[PDB]
């Protein structure tokens, strides 16, 4: 419940909604696949991912650094490559979602590094506090 984790999560939620979800024709990736339009989806894809699941994860503060966040963004691209193939319009769009995500992280690199560094410090400060109690 530290202010650095709250600020970091807030930044990630903003990148998702304001930049990634704003990618033209990205709407099929904004929510989990609807099994009606794609009956064999969950047979083919073992680990499904979408922009809504990521926002729910951000809300639960799953991501303490941009790397675990990147693992879930990259899983969206790899799922599209497997299910629709590399030539698919769905994969080209998934790739564009990934490119804008990396671009926004690059643009906010110093802010994010500082927050990641502060989240790390708060966790270490919490453990030394639980040792001074005796
Ligand atoms: C069939 C379809 C759905 C859809 C859904 C959608 C689909 N399923 C569920 C839900 C709700 O939970 C939403 C969401 N946004 C769409 N497109 C808009 C078009 C205008 N864009 C801005 C352009 C600015 N000049 C932003 C995206 C969609 N376009 C579609 O063709
Ligand atoms: C995210 C996604 C959606 C999608 C939707 C779709 C569109 N509107 C709404 C909804 C509701 O979720 C889904 C429809 N057809 C897709 N692509 C085809 C499916 C058949 N494939 C052959 C596989 C044979 N084993 C070739 C590519 C989709 N592929 C996707 O990756």
Domain limits, the chain: 1-134
Residue ranges of alpha helices (H) inside 45-88 are 51-59, 66-84
Question: Quick check: 12 and 67 in contact, CB under 8 A?
Answer: no
Burial status of residue 86 (CB atoms within 10 A of its CB: 0-12, 13-18, 19 or more): exposed
Q: What are the tokens at 13? A: 């939620």
- How many angstroms is it from 107 CA to the middle of ligand 1? 27
- How many angstroms is it from 18 CA to the middle of ligand 2? 24
Region of 25 on the Ramachandran plot (φ > 0 left; ψ -120 to 50 alpha; else beta): left
CA separation for the pair 116, 34 (Å, rounded): 35
Q: Which residue's alpha carbon is nearest to atom 17 within ligand 1?
A: 27
68-to-57, 82, 92, 133 alpha-carbon distances in Å = 11, 21, 23, 33
At how many Å resolution was this determined? 2.2
CA separation for the pair 71, 130 (Å, rounded): 32
Which ligand gives the minimal distance to the CA of 34? 2
Q: Experimental technique used? A: X-ray
Q: Which of 105, 99, 13 is nearest to 54 (CA)?
A: 13
Which ligand gives the minimal distance to the CA of 77? 2
CA separation for the pair 93, 100 (Å, rounded): 11
């Amino acid at each position: 419940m530290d202010d650095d984790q709250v600020a970091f999560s807030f930044i990630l939620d903003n990148i998702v909604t304001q930049k990634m979800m704003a990618v033209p024709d990205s709407w099929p990736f904004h929510h989990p696949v609807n099994k009606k339009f794609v009956p064999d989806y969950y047979k083919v894809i073992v680990n499904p991912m979408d922009l809504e699941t990521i926002r729910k994860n951000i809300s639960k503060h799953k991501y303490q650094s941009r790397e675990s966040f990147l693992d879930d963004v990259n899983l969206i691209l790899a799922n599209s490559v497997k299910y629709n193939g590399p030539e698919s319009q769905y994969t080209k769009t998934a790739q564009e979602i990934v490119n804008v995500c990396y671009q926004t992280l690059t643009e906010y690199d110093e802010h994010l590094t500082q927050l990641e560094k502060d989240i790390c410090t708060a966790k270490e400060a919490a453990l030394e506090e639980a040792e001074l109690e005796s």
